[PDB]
């Protein structure tokens, strides 16, 4: 419905993936696993498939949260097959 | 050469519904008592409008200027009275009763002659004269026959109220132009037989009396403009009173449609039988009156069938009602129906070609006798390729492709004769039905030879391959026709048209490109208009319509920060897969 | 959420939340400023009035509000030569006089004539003959500048020699440089030229009031028909922040026609070149009148349109078309007209990616205006759908364009997210894609599918269902023609479009099918809709290319 469009992201100097990390690269190891909480407990209440559809950054910006403080990585495998 | 004989034959066959041509020839055989011509004519006539009662009136009013004889008359009556033909009008009834008149008179015969004329005259009043409501000149003469009967014997006297009891407590029930005046007379009478038994009998018709007066009222109202006259004296055809070829009044039908539709509600309460006698008879009234009107046959054949059976009687009628409108296209259908419908086949191409000829021929009679009007002469090019249209898909249904195909080659020969429709509709068929996107192009290309310079074609042409996108040959018309068309109009339509298609399928260099053409030659144009054009969408202009008228609140901040859905919406390396996994681990 | 916040007597948060929703809203930034200054909070009146300016960088009265602020407080060019570089740069020709004027109001100030004296005097001209070549000269409601500039130019006692000539060199300058363009003032300022040649020269005079005679009358000519055609113009946008009321500004998206129409009725009279300036020139008066054309009606595509087509319909430099409609687009965040526009100055650079952001844009700012009206009064289903149509719109037209810069997959990606958006969107783009899928890709399959697709919603919608069938009917799609039927007229509320359903189908029965069949079906249609006629209803069984010819050649009363 309001929620944040996003960004812009120059494409001509940047990439959006080299992007989501300096964001995400800002929030101490605190926040960081302060939100991927919020994200856990938001999925067991569903609603969370539609805001991951209509935002598949938002997918990459959890998906590197998780596996960059360590979650996964054979498992990850296991998302797309 | 000064034989209007022969002059007038020819005339007859070119427009044989001009009911008057065979009038104006028989005012002629006559004057010359060429009474072996005259028959010959008169039954030409008659074989087309078996149903046109003055005709067979002007036929009896022909026989009764000579005493009479049961040798040329019964002959007549036996035609058009028959059962085949149930010409059931009362002007012609009534030339009847005046032979059951003469021969058979009252004195000579006696008791079994007399009371034959009864017969003629009662039949009269079950078949007819009780459902025209204006029939006094009728009942009249009738009564007054009941009237001046002298009793011979106490049979007789008594038989003689018998009989005319009937006929007033049948007629003072029948909505009629003299159900008061007659009522004046009946309750006079009944007191000349009965001055204390004969108040009653006054006393049981009153009921219904009235009943039939108010709905003779109705039927008044109803009946306004009811024009019906038509000579029944081959010497007052006038021509004027009789109507000229496919002409009608269509005020006048829709009167008599009313009338139709009141004899429906069934307010006389009769029996089915009669009830569907009775409208029968208004109906037969009816199509006499605007036999050029198809309405009125399509809507009586769909009716004398609508009842009963024999699925001959739909058609039955329907031919009729063709035969007075030979190159009426809607009992032309109608006809080819009943035909499909009793799977006669052959005759569905006879009765649609007959249509097609008379048309056709309609049109060679315009065209060499006043080229002059094209606004009547392209609306009869029109019908004939219409009932081309109509027919070259029946045969496609019901023959098979083949013949769907001799059908167009036969127009596709009759050159510029008709519009381009035939090419249009031809190659629908063949595109969208059988699927020979190759042919059915070229059904299109092919129209070409007599309408590349036509406009309308053009647009229509375009409009279809773009639609079907047949890239190159949307292209190489509209490459071929910017100098071919004239109409400044429709000619900025094929640029729109183009524009628009490069611009949905091409790219903004072919559109750029082709938009600089486009303004060169059509300066005036509006740019900001055009460029709404260009944008249309199923058709509708969306642009103008509705903007130009006048012409979890934390993780919803991640969201403020992140690029935007389009950077990985390209491919979402995870689906729902990131929901049955993220809420247990 | 945004205005849908909680919030104090902060009256500061809660205009800015407004603020957020509705950025056009000028208005509430003039607020948002007679606020922040109340409280003499010059950090935040200077924050704003750029987020101001940023969006509307050439509203000439915005810039003037600005200045007319900090001629409250004496004066520092400091601030001040910031804010006039800024918005007097190259880049934004603000050309508006009421700006130039508080800029000469400036260099006015900062340039005494008595201390620095000559050269100081010598740079005031300069400030004023600036305005004259690049505006005045242009704006035929100009009387006020001039007075100003020609009695800065009366109050210049002649200090010595070269002073006392050079006087007059200057004021007929003026005076004939203003006696030819069509102003206000044509009239009593030849009074005063007449009088003033009379006050100098005695053998001079009539023959140099005789050499203007010819110009100033075709002058005072122009002017009249443009009078007549400025008729109903009216310019007043507020141009001090206390002026600024709620009704002489435009509140979003707003803009009265009548006076758009009446502008562009000026540039085409302007366009004419009547006073047959050279090309250069007309170009720069032809622009000086579209940025107060667009000044006024900043809210109107149609302006912003007409003018970046003409600021390079002339020009190479392919980046002043995509620039001004830019600026445009900012004005109506929303306009699908410079939505595209714009997506086609960026494919006519390849620049791709531009295309899609600029495109989606107008999307989120429309699905914006459309949950903006829903759950602001959903009692309105009139404009609750004419809002789901432009999205819908929108879409179509963006789903077309990726079906061709990029190609079928993202081509369906974009239909996917409509689907997604259930009934948000009007039937219209199921529709679209069934013919993209159809008649383009000639994918028959997919096509049929998108269409069924779109039942799930759209299954009592008599009008999608008629659509739906038409095209099922023309390509022949047999069986799924005959299915959607049955499915359907228990669903159809409207009589009338239920009625057309089963007319269509009796239509594609004596066509395709038999006689039988069609009897049937008919028995069928009379039976539910017996107030029909059954001639009228014979006449379409039989219509071709889509034309009833059985009523137009003969049963013609009907």
């Known amino acids: ?81 | 050469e000064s034989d209007v004989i022969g002059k007038l034959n020819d005339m007859i066959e070119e427009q044989p519904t001009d009911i008057f041509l065979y009038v104006k020839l028989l005012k002629h055989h006559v004057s010359l008592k060429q009474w072996k011509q005259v028959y010959e004519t008169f039954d030409k006539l008659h074989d087309r409008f078996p149903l046109m009662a003055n005709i067979w009136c002007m036929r009896l009013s022909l026989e009764f200027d000579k005493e009479l004889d049961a040798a040329v008359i019964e002959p007549v009556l036996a035609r058009c009275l028959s059962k085949e033909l149930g010409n059931n009008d009362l002007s012609l009834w009534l030339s009847y009763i005046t032979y059951v008149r003469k021969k058979n008179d009252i004195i000579t015969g006696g008791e079994e002659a007399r009371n034959i004329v009864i017969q003629a005259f009662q039949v009269v009043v079950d078949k007819c004269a009780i459902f025209e409501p204006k029939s006094i000149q009728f009942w009249n003469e009738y009564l007054h026959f009941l009237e001046h009967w002298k009793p011979v014997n106490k049979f007789e006297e008594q038989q003689r109220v018998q009989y005319i009891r009937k006929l007033y407590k049948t007629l003072l029930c029948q909505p009629m132009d003299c159900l008061e005046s007659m009522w004046q007379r009946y309750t006079q009478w009944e007191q000349d037989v009965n001055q204390l038994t004969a108040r009653r009998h006054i006393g049981e018709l009153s009921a219904q009396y009235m009943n039939a007066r108010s709905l003779y009222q109705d039927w008044l109202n109803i009946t306004k403009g009811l024009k019906r006259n038509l000579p029944i004296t081959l010497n007052q055809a006038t021509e004027s009173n009789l109507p000229k070829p496919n002409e009608y009044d269509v005020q006048q039908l829709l009167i008599w449609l009313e009338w139709i539709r009141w004899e429906s509600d069934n307010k006389l309460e009769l029996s089915d039988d009669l009830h569907k006698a009775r409208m029968t008879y208004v109906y037969m009234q009816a199509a006499q009156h605007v036999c050029f009107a198809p309405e009125i046959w399509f809507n009586m054949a769909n009716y004398q069938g609508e009842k009963n059976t024999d699925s001959t009687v739909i058609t039955k009628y329907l031919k009729l009602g063709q035969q007075c409108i030979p190159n009426s296209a809607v009992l032309a259908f109608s006809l080819s129906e009943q035909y499909e419908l009793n799977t006669k086949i052959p005759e569905i191409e006879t009765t649609i070609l007959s249509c097609i000829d008379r048309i056709h021929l309609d049109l060679a009679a315009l065209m060499e006798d006043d080229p002059t009007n094209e606004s009547a002469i392209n609306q009869l090019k029109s019908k004939l390729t219409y009932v081309y249209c109509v027919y070259m898909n029946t045969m496609k249904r019901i023959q098979g492709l083949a013949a769907s195909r001799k059908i167009f080659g036969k127009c596709r020969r009759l050159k510029k004769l008709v519009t381009p429709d035939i090419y249009l509709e031809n190659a629908y068929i063949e595109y969208h039905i059988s699927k020979d996107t190759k042919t059915a192009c070229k059904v299109l290309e092919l129209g070409l030879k007599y309408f590349a310079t036509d406009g309308e074609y053009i647009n229509k042409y375009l409009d279809f391959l773009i639609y079907v996108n047949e890239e190159s040959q949307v292209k190489s018309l509209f490459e071929s026709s910017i100098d071919k068309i004239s109409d400044s109009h429709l000619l900025k339509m094929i640029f729109q048209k183009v524009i628009f298609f490069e611009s949905k399928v091409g790219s903004l260099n072919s559109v750029r490109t082709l938009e600089k053409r486009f303004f060169e030659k059509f300066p005036e144009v509006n740019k900001l208009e055009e460029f709404t054009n260009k944008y249309k969408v199923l058709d509708v202009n969306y642009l103008q319509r509705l903007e130009l008228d006048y012409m979890p609140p934390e993780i919803v901040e991640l969201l403020k920060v992140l690029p935007k859905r389009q950077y990985f919406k390209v491919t979402i390396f995870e689906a729902h897969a990131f929901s049955e996994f993220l809420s247990d681990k």
């Not at chain 1, 812009?8 to 909480?37: F, H, R």
């Open chain 1, 1 to 81: 419905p309001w929620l944040p469009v996003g960004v812009d992201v120059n494409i001509n100097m940047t990439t959006p993936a080299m992007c989501i990390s300096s964001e995400l690269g800002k929030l101490q190891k605190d926040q960081q696993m302060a939100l991927l909480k919020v994200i856990q407990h938001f999925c067991k209440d569903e609603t969370f498939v539609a805001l991951l559809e209509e935002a598949p950054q938002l997918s990459y910006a959890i998906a590197e949260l998780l596996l960059s403080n360590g979650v996964c990585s054979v498992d990850q495998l296991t998302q797309l097959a």
